[PDB]
From a paper:
We have recently identified a periplasmic protein AztD in Paracoccus denitrificans, which is able to transfer zinc to the cluster A-I SBP AztC23. In each case, the protein adopts a beta-propeller fold composed of continuous antiparallel beta sheets forming 8, 3-, and 4-stranded blades and containing a disulfide bond between highly conserved Cys214 and Cys231 (P. denitrificans numbering). Two high-affinity zinc-binding sites are identified, only one of which is competent for transfer to AztC.
The crystal structure of CkAztD has two monomers in the asymmetric unit while PdAztD has 4. Site 1 is present in the central pore of the protein and zinc is coordinated by His124, His167, His218, and a solvent molecule. Site 2 is contained on an extension from the body of the protein composed of the N- and C-terminal beta strands and a beta hairpin from blade 2. Zinc is coordinated by His99, His102, Asp104, and the side chain of the C-terminal His408. Zinc ligands at both sites are highly conserved in ≥95% of AztD homologues with the exception of His408, which is only conserved in 68.1% of analyzed sequences. All zinc occupancies refined to > 0.7 in PdAztD and 0.4 in CkAztD. The crystal structures do not allow us to determine whether associative transfer of zinc to AztC occurs from PdAztD site 1, site 2 or both. The mutagenesis data clearly demonstrates that zinc is transferred exclusively from AztD site 2 to AztC, leaving one to question the function of the highly conserved site 1. The cooperative nature of binding between sites 1 and 2 suggest that site 1 may function to tune the overall zinc-binding affinity to the needs of the organism.
Numbering used by the authors:
A (entry chain C): 32 to 96, 104 to 187, 192 to 408
B (entry chain A): 28 to 185, 192 to 408
C (entry chain B): 31 to 99, 102 to 187, 192 to 408
D (entry chain D): 28 to 186, 193 to 408
Amino acid sequence: TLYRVFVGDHEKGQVTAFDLAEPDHRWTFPTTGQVKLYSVAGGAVVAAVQSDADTVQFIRSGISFDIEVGDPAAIDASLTGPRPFHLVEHDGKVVLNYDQGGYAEILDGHALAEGKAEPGRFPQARAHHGFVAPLGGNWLSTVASDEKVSVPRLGLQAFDAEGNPAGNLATCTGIHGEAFSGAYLAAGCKEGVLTVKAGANGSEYKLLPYPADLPQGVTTGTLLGSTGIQVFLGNYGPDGLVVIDPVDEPHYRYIKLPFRRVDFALDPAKPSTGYVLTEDGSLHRIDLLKAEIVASAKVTEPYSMDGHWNDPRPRIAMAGDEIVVTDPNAGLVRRIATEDLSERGTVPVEGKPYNIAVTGGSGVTH
Amino acid sequence: HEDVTLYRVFVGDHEKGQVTAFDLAEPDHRWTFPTTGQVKLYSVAGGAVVAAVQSDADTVQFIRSGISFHDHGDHRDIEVGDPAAIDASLTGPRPFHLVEHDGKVVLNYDQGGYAEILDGHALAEGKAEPGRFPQARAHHGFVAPLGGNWLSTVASDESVPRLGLQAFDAEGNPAGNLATCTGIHGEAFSGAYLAAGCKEGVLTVKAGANGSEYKLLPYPADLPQGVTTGTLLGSTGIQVFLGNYGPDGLVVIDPVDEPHYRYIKLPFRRVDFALDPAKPSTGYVLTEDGSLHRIDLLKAEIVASAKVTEPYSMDGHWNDPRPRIAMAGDEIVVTDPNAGLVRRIATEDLSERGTVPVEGKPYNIAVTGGSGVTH
Amino acid sequence: VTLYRVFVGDHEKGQVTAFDLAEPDHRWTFPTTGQVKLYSVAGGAVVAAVQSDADTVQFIRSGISFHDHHRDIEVGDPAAIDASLTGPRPFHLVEHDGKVVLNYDQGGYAEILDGHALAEGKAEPGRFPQARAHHGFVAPLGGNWLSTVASDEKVSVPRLGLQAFDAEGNPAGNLATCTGIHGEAFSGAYLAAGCKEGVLTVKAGANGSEYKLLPYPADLPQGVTTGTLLGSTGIQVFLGNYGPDGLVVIDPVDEPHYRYIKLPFRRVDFALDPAKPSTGYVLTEDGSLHRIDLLKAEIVASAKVTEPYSMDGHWNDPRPRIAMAGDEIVVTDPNAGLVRRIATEDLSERGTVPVEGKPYNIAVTGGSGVTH
Amino acid sequence: HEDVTLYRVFVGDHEKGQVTAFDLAEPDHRWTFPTTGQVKLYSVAGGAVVAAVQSDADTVQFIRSGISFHDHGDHRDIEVGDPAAIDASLTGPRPFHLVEHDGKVVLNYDQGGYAEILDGHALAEGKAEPGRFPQARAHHGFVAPLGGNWLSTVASDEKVPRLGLQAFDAEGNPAGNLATCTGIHGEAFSGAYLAAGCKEGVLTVKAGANGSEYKLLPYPADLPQGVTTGTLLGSTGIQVFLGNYGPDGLVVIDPVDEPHYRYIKLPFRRVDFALDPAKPSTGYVLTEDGSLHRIDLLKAEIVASAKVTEPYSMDGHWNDPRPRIAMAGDEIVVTDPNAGLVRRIATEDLSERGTVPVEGKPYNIAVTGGSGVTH
Ligand SMILES: [Zn+2]
Ligand SMILES: [Zn+2]
Ligand SMILES: [Zn+2]
Ligand SMILES: [Zn+2]
Ligand SMILES: [Zn+2]
Ligand SMILES: [Zn+2]
Ligand SMILES: [Zn+2]
Ligand SMILES: [Zn+2]
């Protein structure tokens, strides 16, 4: 097996890649600005969205799945536009929201994997901080209000390729955050969590309103979907999580955090578990079956969640039986064992390592 | 539709039986309430009620804020009217420490051997008739609601020495064994925990399935010797306590994991402190040189300081006229008794945004209000 | 029980008089090789009597000891320690981190004693080597030994500054400039020392000694320096002289680092009040004692306690010396043959203690504790 | 007929009484001048003279530039020779702020209770003969020529608060009423206006037929509270001032039209700033992280940034060794005390075009010269 870690800097436009098992096998790729990294097209491509720099660039991992392995390589075709931000990949498509452009860009995943980045433009009625998700042959876009001044958002709506409605608007006030699991897309709302099921008889919309038992005045705005069981992990305020079952009641099981959340991830190698890093520097194992934190260990120094959302703070990603955690002030990436959260080693990375993504896995060569 | 923010500050005098209230952002909107004697002030019932404990004068009076928040509600409604006295007192021998939790306000009568229980919601609707909680003996203690029980301090048989803490029923019948906490003093809630200061360390109790779960956190041998934690604050945002440790120290207390204590050495002796609920990884401590310091609770260190008053030496009596601080959103309000004013300090950078004149020697302070929605 | 025991040296004879403050007829006399400068050491269990002119350092057991099990006090008669140190011109004494360190001005080394061993009656020193003999000091800090360092001028020895060493004199970092370095004290996290350029501060750091010079502000009187420092034990602040007729309250952390106090006459002696750490006391050459508010950096009360003792002439002429004993200041009065007791509360004279000779240097041991 | 450009930079040491001069484009053409103490440098008399005010050393000395320009109908001719000390010096108790206007150079003696008035032309021909302007009381102030009057700051009596600004004749006889400007500090000219910083806002004055015309620009309520403008630059292009507003803010101040204020939040605290006379509305500000930022004065925003020095925290005393900046045509020159150099930064793109080594810890800076004609 081969995991290749891709680490961004907090300030410089730079992506560092290294083989997890031999960090001396390393590469550097230049970018226009600060990167937020996404493993896409099955891990054959890393997308480096640079919101502040109106740019999106791509890097070949280049691990393709049998597994074929070569050195990573930049894709020179890039993308430019006004504040690309949220990236959604589903049904073989990568979709990029341009927050200050009022449109999204649709890329074919296979085409990216062969080094081509020629997008089709999806029009939106108004520019805003949104996303566009492929589902059931439609493009499900967030929809802003026409009310003037940060743009208020009304909900989610299915559209065709030309940006004409393919279904009615589903109310989801302030819609934010999205994930897929099983047959379901989920998105965070002021009223609860909106689910859409790609079903045999078409798309099924159902809002799951927040139960009265949940803390008041706070919402789910960030979602992860398990790849193994049909369940979502969402935040619920800065100091809580909800395990969300989209099918049966009760839809929500709340988990109280003792410090505020810095980042989290679900373990694709152990689909009934995830990890959450909190501002005291502790990484916690989440048992999705029990809906509780079941183990913790301090892995970084504290990083207060007070201040600005994009300040330098640790980011996490999964790589096999390890969690990789960037530590910007320490200039390094820490490797934590999923088995018992022991520290297996560190990897020096120059500068302030910030965002992170992982590609690869286990395969056959013959 | 407007988000409305409105903080109303309540200031007691060091000598006069007087509470001054004013709108923080509009200090000419102000009111004065007479009291029997020197007040110690507490915001209770979500800020709908200010309790004015007057220990030396054996009474507690209440003032309606009257800023109240109500859940419509996909959100929070704010209702604003003039403050107004509640005519109904509580009366007794030297009430002192006040505890609010699980919707109850509880007052300890140091010279009476009982505490009085008031319902928070009933106070906010203007009623102050308490239910009595009997104690085996009079002492300087407290009674805290927890897990359906009443956790009271307990005196010895011999200032009255105190043995520890114990869970009781409403009639004062024991609901569990005494938890040793010698000289028990100071208390606060954070996350799942009640904490109280002891001679041996800090006692924690959490509501458990078989009742309250007690655990003593012993003071490490590293800590300066001969001094203890006797005053505690609990964060409402994260699960952590801040206590003093001697006159010139603080401890950040983690109730869960080791290390339970992280010591912060203050450069001058402590006058007052407060935690910032709007920025829960931070607090503020005022020291006797007149400096206000921002506390990083996560790293347990002082991270910024500025001189905000003239010095107020900690030599002399604990109740001499000295500043008191309270939080009001993105400001700390600091009373300055000798100057006749309350100072407004920005939490962002510790700059002084302005001052508010208050007659006399403004002493104790409490804050009501916040942010909400109208219609 | 509270018990303060005063130790008074003579200006000429090698003699220390000890007496219980509350009953001065409970007294003892100890001979010494020569004129003493007295230091309360090992928490008050031991008095060190440095005799610079006589190449000797002798010790006297207090003997008041506190067994911080609140705190227990044990009281017995004071007693000489028979083991003494001898060497060329011992002078400045520093106590910190359980170590008492003596600088031999004409020996080019210092002697390190363990405070605990002294309190149990043993005086076996270790030798700290220096590059060159000079009037300096050696201070423990963060596992290192911060020694003053002389120049190679020829040949009073000019001094370059302060430098960290290990116990054998191997350098642990570069020398920090502090020209004519003189005076030292600890308060809070800081060591401070006086320089021509200002006051050098040093903190124990993760990677070793962390130096920071505070240069004298231009608003301060010119041509004069801080050469004598006291450090508070209850707050983090230093009191230094600044010239013969000024004081500076020194904040090692924030600006302003210096706050000047003009004295009405030149300074004879000063001390900080450990029982009231925001206050100190300064005696001026007119014979007045002044209370210093360290927080406000000002004199807040004055009273005449002795006849004048001009600061003209030699620095070691017979002059009053002061020390704290609970709620009193004790003031030697060499010409009157007395120790005067001054109440800190209101600076009135609570009494006198007649002593043989010309009482000069003074130190206080004891305090308050519990008995059973 | 030849267009010649030649800038001559003058740099003071932070410690030594020393001014270094060098031709910007050929730094090996350089000169050194001794002074009594630490200098603050001012280009005066069209750049023919550098004034070296030494506040701590109770001295002011002058250096002939000596690059001078001479009007020539269509254009200016440039005259170039070596610089040279002016032998006449001035002494007095703490000379500090210097104002030049209407051909007069005026120096405020902070601890003397007067200012000295010098004629620019006499200075340019090498004479330092001051005229006396008396003040009611010594203070940290300034005296500005305007409309035939002398506008002096005015202190209180007491025993120092400053009350405002007042117009006088040359004898110190009041020519108008006191204009309130509490704590008045900082001044600049732009167009018809003198401006000065106040606790209440920014005071502006224009020369009118009935004497000085005052109008205070009160700080808008939207601005951060409790902080002030105390340092002002006057634009030669649009008619606007650039002031600080707190340690980490700027305001573009329009004395004629609303909005009178446009606020700029700096990412770190301000070290120094300057306006670019080659452009109608561009300035430069150096912040404590070592970044130089280009300010668009009409949009009131930072439009470009680059790191130019190591960090120099604004913690500590204002007069500690820190970079200072000045304009030289299409470059900014930045002193770098720790690096021992002056850095040349291109205004077009903020790149480092070169450095010039200077002895010691280069601190304050002034620039003389420019573009002119030779025949
Ligand atoms: Zn195969
Ligand atoms: Zn977002
Ligand atoms: Zn509502
Ligand atoms: Zn109490
Ligand atoms: Zn005992
Ligand atoms: Zn000496
Ligand atoms: Zn010409
Ligand atoms: Zn000034």
